[PDB]
Amino acid sequence: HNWEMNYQEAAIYLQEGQNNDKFFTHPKDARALAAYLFVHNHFFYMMELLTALLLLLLSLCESPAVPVLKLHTYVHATLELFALMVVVFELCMKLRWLGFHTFVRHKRTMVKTSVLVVQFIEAIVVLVRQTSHVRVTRALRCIFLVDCRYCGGVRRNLRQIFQSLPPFMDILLLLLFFMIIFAILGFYLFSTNPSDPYFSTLENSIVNLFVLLTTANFPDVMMPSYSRNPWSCVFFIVYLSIELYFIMNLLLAVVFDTFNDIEKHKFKSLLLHKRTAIQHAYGLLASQRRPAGISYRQFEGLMRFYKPRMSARERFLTFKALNQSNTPLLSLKDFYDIYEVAALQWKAKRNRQHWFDELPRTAFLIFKGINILVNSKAFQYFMYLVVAVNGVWILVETFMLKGGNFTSKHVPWSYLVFLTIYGVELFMKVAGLGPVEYLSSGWNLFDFSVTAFAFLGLLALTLNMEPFYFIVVLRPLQLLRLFKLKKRYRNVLDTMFELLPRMASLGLTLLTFYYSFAIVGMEFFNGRLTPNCCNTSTVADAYRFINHTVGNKTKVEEGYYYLNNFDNILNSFVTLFELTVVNNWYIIMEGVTSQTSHWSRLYFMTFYIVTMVVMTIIVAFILEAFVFRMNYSRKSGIVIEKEMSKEELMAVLELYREERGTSSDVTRLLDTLSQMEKYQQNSMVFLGRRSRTKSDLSLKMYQEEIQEWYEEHAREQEQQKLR
Amino acid sequence: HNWEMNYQEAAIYLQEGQNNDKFFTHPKDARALAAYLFVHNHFFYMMELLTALLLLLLSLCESPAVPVLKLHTYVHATLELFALMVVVFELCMKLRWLGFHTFVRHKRTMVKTSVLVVQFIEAIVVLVRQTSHVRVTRALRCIFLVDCRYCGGVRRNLRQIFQSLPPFMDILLLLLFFMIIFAILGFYLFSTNPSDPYFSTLENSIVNLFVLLTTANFPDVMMPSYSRNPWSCVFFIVYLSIELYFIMNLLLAVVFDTFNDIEKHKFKSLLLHKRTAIQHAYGLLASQRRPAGISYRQFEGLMRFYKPRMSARERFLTFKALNQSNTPLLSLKDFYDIYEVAALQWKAKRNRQHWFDELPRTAFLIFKGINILVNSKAFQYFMYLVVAVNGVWILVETFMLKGGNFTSKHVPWSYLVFLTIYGVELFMKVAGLGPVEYLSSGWNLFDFSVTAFAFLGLLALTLNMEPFYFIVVLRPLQLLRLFKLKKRYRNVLDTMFELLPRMASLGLTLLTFYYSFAIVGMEFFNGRLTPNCCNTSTVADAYRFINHTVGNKTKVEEGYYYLNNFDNILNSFVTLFELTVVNNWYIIMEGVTSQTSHWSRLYFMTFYIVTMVVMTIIVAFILEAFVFRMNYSRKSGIVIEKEMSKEELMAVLELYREERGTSSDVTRLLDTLSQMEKYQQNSMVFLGRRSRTKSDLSLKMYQEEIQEWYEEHAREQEQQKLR
Numbered sequence A, B: 001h002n003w004e005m006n007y008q009e010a011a012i013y014l015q016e017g018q019n020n021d022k023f024f025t026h027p028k029d030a031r032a033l034a035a036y037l038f039v040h041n042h043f044f045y046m047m048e049l050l051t052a053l054l055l056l057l058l059s060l061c062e063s064p065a066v067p068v069l070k071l072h073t074y075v076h077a078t079l080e081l082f083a084l085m086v087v088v089f090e091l092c093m094k095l096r097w098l099g100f101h102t103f104v105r106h107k108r109t110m111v112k113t114s115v116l117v118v119q120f121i122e123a124i125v126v127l128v129r130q131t132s133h134v135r136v137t138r139a140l141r142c143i144f145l146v147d148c149r150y151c152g153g154v155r156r157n158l159r160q161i162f163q164s165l166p167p168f169m170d171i172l173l174l175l176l177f178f179m180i181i182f183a184i185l186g187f188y189l190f191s192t193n194p195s196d197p198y199f200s201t202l203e204n205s206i207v208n209l210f211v212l213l214t215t216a217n218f219p220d221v222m223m224p225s226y227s228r229n230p231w232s233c234v235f236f237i238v239y240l241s242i243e244l245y246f247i248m249n250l251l252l253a254v255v256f257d258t259f260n261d262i263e264k265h266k267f268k269s270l271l272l273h274k275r276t277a278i279q280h281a282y283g284l285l286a287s288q289r290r291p292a293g294i295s296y297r298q299f300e301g302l303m304r305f306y307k308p309r310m311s312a313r314e315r316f317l318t319f320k321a322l323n324q325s326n327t328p329l330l331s332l333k334d335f336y337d338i339y340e341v342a343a344l345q346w347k348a349k350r351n352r353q354h355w356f357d358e359l360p361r362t363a364f365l366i367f368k369g370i371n372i373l374v375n376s377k378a379f380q381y382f383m384y385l386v387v388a389v390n391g392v393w394i395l396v397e398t399f400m401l402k403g404g405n406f407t408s409k410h411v412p413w414s415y416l417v418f419l420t421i422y423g424v425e426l427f428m429k430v431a432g433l434g435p436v437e438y439l440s441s442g443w444n445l446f447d448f449s450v451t452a453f454a455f456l457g458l459l460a461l462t463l464n465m466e467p468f469y470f471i472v473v474l475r476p477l478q479l480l481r482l483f484k485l486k487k488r489y490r491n492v493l494d495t496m497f498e499l500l501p502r503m504a505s506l507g508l509t510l511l512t513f514y515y516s517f518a519i520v521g522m523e524f525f526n527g528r529l530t531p532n533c534c535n536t537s538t539v540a541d542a543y544r545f546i547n548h549t550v551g552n553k554t555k556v557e558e559g560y561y562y563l564n565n566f567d568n569i570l571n572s573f574v575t576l577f578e579l580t581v582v583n584n585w586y587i588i589m590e591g592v593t594s595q596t597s598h599w600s601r602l603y604f605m606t607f608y609i610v611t612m613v614v615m616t617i618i619v620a621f622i623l624e625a626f627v628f629r630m631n632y633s634r635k636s637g638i639v640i641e642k643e644m645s646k647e648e649l650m651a652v653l654e655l656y657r658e659e660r661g662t663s664s665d666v667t668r669l670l671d672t673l674s675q676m677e678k679y680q681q682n683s684m685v686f687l688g689r690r691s692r693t694k695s696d697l698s699l700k701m702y703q704e705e706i707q708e709w710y711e712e713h714a715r716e717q718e719q720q721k722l723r
């Protein structure tokens, strides 16, 4: 019980090295160990996130809601009470794990407790009065999402846009300085004009130049001055070529540079944190013996709690893979590489195929012959001609049937023939190569997926299921196979498919900002946009709904911009998505401000600044990752190969049978014995493959100054371990 | 005559090292030397450019012209004949300088001869018929501009956008591939709708999705589908978030990376070309003596033809500054640095001020005391409070006089008092510091310039000159002094003012592309846009001009987009500038195509692709230069200090009086003798300051692999100098 307490404690010291938290897990009692084990279970994470998504997705049943989900007020008030009750359960177990002083000084938990208190109080107020008040506190409900473990990518993304914000704010200050100067001079030059509503008041000119900054109304503000005096074009040329050409590109440059330094120090602090984590782990497995090292049974324990799904043969392989010495023990230099060796999967050296062992003759030459021909180059070179024939067939059938080849309810024999030939070569390729040897590439599962949609088109044509005909309309996705010829497409789609998870996280941060702005706009802008509204405004043309009932058929004219409501979450997400692409945003602004006040211009101006920050940080991320990988591949997974003897396997078998593990460890070592008996050899030569990530990539790039970081951090340990 | 022929030939070998041309100047006769000297005179350059700008600026007098400059047809036909006659004079002297084989194999000159031939022939045709034909050949007239010497920056910029074009074109191909897929499926889903003109035909849907790609009509195309089925938002969300979020940012990343490699190899090939230039220069000054080196009188000759304006004392200073050895001769290692030492200006060590030598007492304590106090910190700290008082005064007077503080014809005592205090401290600072010690900074000449505008405001207020009142309207430019407090503004405005010449060149390349597209659109789109035109089109609302003559005052409504003509060069430059900022470009497209054909959509689509290339290359340039300087200042002009003795100055005086130069060399060495006699010393200690450029910056950055470039190039000389 003493050793296993040391093994679980040391396995915690490795697990906390990856998630960038400071070290708090040191137990005085075993109750803290049981509390860590209770709160870092996989079930606790899924409970925490599913409560958070229930608490967000309940907001489409509130007093502004879709009409099909309009619950009664006590129902959703009680559902908020139960969801907040189990969030109190979450914080109760967090308090049991940490202390009391650590639970207060930790900032993130205290933020979540405060938001819990205010939403709990206002929920009880709703349940008493049974009428919803203004209830603007729902915008803070995102904090329950972001504190979860599964969106820690969202969290470090969000602090990365926080840290890059001062070099944004100063250049934003310079840009606003020039628009106030040009708004003053614009008010002087064009206010003496009874024809334009664009420069009637100095505040109205500040508004119209803030909209001109983002290129939203450019010719329409220039024209009434350009009608009188043709030399007024120099005003808008000089203004727009200062801001759109100097200052905006300057802003992209400055945020890009700061993003580079933040990436460098993020990597550095992660390395130093992993360094102290491994040093504490080696310290807990101290020897009190005349050599300094770790015996094999302790490394059994570390791989028995950390990485629990790794069996015995791979455990001994990881012990030799870290060894790199002819010793019975380990070191530190041969032990700091534990993160990059324990992450791989081990295989033996067979040469078989997954569909040949059952086979006798008279059919083995068939399938082996298919594997032979499917490895040939001219077969692939035949397949690209088939795809090109498909593409010319779609193009010629298009410009012969005059574009009417898609609405018809009979397929003109193209999609039948082509899906047959793609399908039989799909089945031939998979059965020829084996399933896992086929799935291991990238483009092949794309071929499998798109034909997998495509057979449902045949399920849609011959049967009585009309609305699946759009799969038949998606013929030309098969031409996307053909991009794998040119080299730059393979490179740039490799980096596209490798940057996808971070762009998913950036998208979810953007949905956080949309959620809070959608709620805080949902309450104040509820029913202020109707058809034929805002008729006294200046953009009254866009809000119109006119019947022309001549001929008893009432042909209707409408400008449709009244559909951008703020009625529920769904119309407001569609509206806010129409504001982040920039064009025609001042129409929604001038409509809402023509119904509420002058102060609600400030809502939309603030929204444009926030979406400007988020989009320029997305651009900066894509540029850094693409430049970093392109600099790697012009300065040059991984496969390791080791081997173990027969007698070492027998002795380790004696130790494992002594230690009395499960039957799987014994019988898989017996299976290794059967492989040595069937092949009639002495040593088992193995392979371990690991995929290459950004961490090892950054180690190869910053390999010049990294030793200075280690040595400086070593003496800063000694300055902080004499006190 | 033998030595001076060697000096002028070697000075040519240095001058051709900078301008990246290959070596052709080797003379068999002195006539080639006289031809080089005739064609690289400063007068020849100014003749070449002024002919080119006359030939471009004549195009605003043609058959499409402004009505105030409408010349007769024989007049401008003859002016084209004379301008092309002197361009033939230019090519005649170019042919005299080179050979005949070199003049043909050189590509750039042969391009200019061919364009000369076709414009000469069509000019004679105009002079015969006296009526202008379609005359589309004027778009090629830009080649006469770009071949000049003063816009060689334009030329290397233009080949840099040529070389970066394939990694643009392949991703453009992928982006067009996805818009054709979504146009097919958009035509299937929304053609069964009698309410929208956006998906009536497959070609019309390809057009509207190509416009949706550039965010020009985003809500207006979404709405008629969004009115029927609210789930049609997923179509435009998925489409716009593939293209605007993955592919467009991918295009910026790819063009950025290629721009980095092109910058690296541009710097490398410039270094190797300078290397061979100096080796030929040292070869022409070969010794045929028992040491290997260059005597002083030959270095006199090199500095007498190369850098002619450098006098004798600075010549000897440059001979010791290259020496770095106790030798009477030179080397190669001490001679490859000739470009970076000959570029500086030498000064002595005085300590006086430019306004103190005349002064006796009773006024010397005045001006010296002013220099004392103007060097003090709390005086500057007083001045920033004065500027902040000015800013709060403008703001409070604005929100007290309700924005009407600018139209009034009396100044409310602010601009009088503030221009007096800024003015007296300007004169106090300049007279206290001296003129050249004041101008040498950056912000100080900004203060001088803005107050220099500001006194003309007092010339405008009290006098009978009304239209200069806008200088009084430009009060708040004085607040731009106050940005020099925060550090990041000083850094980012240093890089802004240091990247300005290249952005000027990028702007002039953009005006080249506008010029050719303005002419080729001027002839075919001449009178096709009138008021109340295009009424059968779909954008007929924008072209309207209606009188409402009730009440005998005729209040007029108009949509103003008929002013974007193609009548002359000036309305067409204003139109094309309205197309490069993107917004509302499809209205000009749909108008012109509603008057000509369907084929003139292709004009505007081609223009959007061209301006997309040019703008993303401007963005890539700003990012590289800003990142490069920010990486320099986080891995860390120049001043050198040397001295010469008295006897060395006397001996070199004997040699210069032997060689019988002008009186300036003798009498300035006599002035150095008078300084040694007045200060009563032995040695003159001097300083040479040089401004830091991108070349030395790049030498400090790429200092790791540069020796490999030199040694590889040395053996590639030996492989190319055994044959």
Ligand SMILES: *[C@@H]1O[C@H](CO)[C@@H](O[C@@H]2O[C@H](CO)[C@@H](O)[C@H](O)[C@H]2NC(C)=O)[C@H](O)[C@H]1NC(C)=O
Pocket (backbone or CB within 6 Å): A535, A536
């Ligand atoms: C502009 O809109 C207002 C409503 O905001 C219209 O005013 C209404 O006019 C009708 C006559 O058609 C009256 O019966 C209502 O009592 C008015 N309502 C209010 C609140 O005043 C106005 O007519 C519209 N102007 C137009 C369409 O030109």
Ligand SMILES: *[C@@H]1O[C@H](CO)[C@@H](O[C@@H]2O[C@H](CO)[C@@H](O)[C@H](O)[C@H]2NC(C)=O)[C@H](O)[C@H]1NC(C)=O
Pocket (backbone or CB within 6 Å): B535, B536
């Ligand atoms: C649309 O514009 C055309 C001109 O392009 C107009 O057609 C003219 O109509 C007037 C009657 O007002 C006739 O006298 C002319 O002979 C017509 N010209 C041509 C070339 O057909 C037409 O009326 C306009 N339609 C509107 C304003 O609804």
Ligand SMILES: *[C@@H]1O[C@H](CO)[C@@H](O)[C@H](O)[C@H]1NC(C)=O
Pocket (backbone or CB within 6 Å): A545, A546, A547, A554
């Ligand atoms: C137009 O007529 C329809 C009935 O066909 C009606 O539903 C709609 O409200 C009318 N629009 C008005 C009165 O603005």
Ligand SMILES: *[C@@H]1O[C@H](CO)[C@@H](O)[C@H](O)[C@H]1NC(C)=O
Pocket (backbone or CB within 6 Å): B545, B546, B547, B554
């Ligand atoms: C409107 O009236 C003015 C005269 O005040 C005239 O110049 C203009 O051509 C008229 N516009 C029309 C008839 O469209």
Ligand code: NA
Pocket (backbone or CB within 6 Å): A215, A216, A582, A583, B215, B216, B582, B583
């Ligand atoms: Na836009």
Ligand code: NA
Pocket (backbone or CB within 6 Å): none
């Ligand atoms: Na951009």
